[PDB]
Amino acid sequence: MNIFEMLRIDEGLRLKIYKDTEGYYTIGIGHLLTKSPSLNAAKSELDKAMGRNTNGVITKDEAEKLFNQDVDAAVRGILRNAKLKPVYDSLDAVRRAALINMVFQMGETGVAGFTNSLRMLQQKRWDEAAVNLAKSRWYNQTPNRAKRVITTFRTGTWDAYK
Numbered sequence: 001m002n003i004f005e006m007l008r009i010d011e012g013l014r015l016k017i018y019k020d021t022e023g024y025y026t027i028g029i030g031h032l033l034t035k036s037p038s039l040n041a042a043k044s045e046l047d048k049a050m051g052r053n054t055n056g057v058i059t060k061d062e063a064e065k066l067f068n069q070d071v072d073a074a075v076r077g078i079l080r081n082a083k084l085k086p087v088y089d090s091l092d093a094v095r096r097a098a099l100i101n102m103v104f105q106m107g108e109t110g111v112a113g114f115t116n117s118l119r120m121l122q123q124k125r126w127d128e129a130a131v132n133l134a135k136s137r138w139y140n141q142t143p144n145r146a147k148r149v150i151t152t153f154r155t156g157t158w159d160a161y162k
């Protein structure tokens with residue numbers, strides 16, 4: 001299992017514009033287009049992203065291409081972030097994936113706000129962090145997904161995705 005496979009499970013794959021769990025226009029593999037309520041604004045951003053007139057629809061290949069860029073960006077966001085980097089560096093390979101997932105879903109900023117959990121993860125206090133992570137909007141809004149990531153941090157294994 002790896003980051004790609006993992007996120008692909010959490011996000012799914014859609015070829016037509018859609019609304020995410022928060023009601024934002026998205027496409028592909030969890031690629032957010034825009035927070036605006038306007039579909040046109042969405043279509044616009046999409047075309048700009050694909051370099052072509054999509055008419056709100058892309059191919060698998062294109063989705064995958066977005067997905068690659070989005071993963072890379074996330075890693076890079078982590079690495080450039082002063083609060084994130086050190087955490088990420090302290091972790092093992094599976095757990096890193098877990099950090100990446102959260103960043104992909106919520107943004108480097110969103111993640112950097114779990115200050116307390118971050119600190120616990122850094123100290124390798126697995127059960128405590130799991131508990132702290134759960135006290136969050138994130139967990140309350142997307143419980144199944146949150147559970148999977150959290151188990152991942154807790155165990156350092158892929159069991160939740162098997």
Ligand SMILES: [Cl-]
Nearest residue numbers: 048049066069
């Ligand atoms: Cl983009």
Ligand SMILES: [Cl-]
Nearest residue numbers: 142143144145
């Ligand atoms: Cl969920």
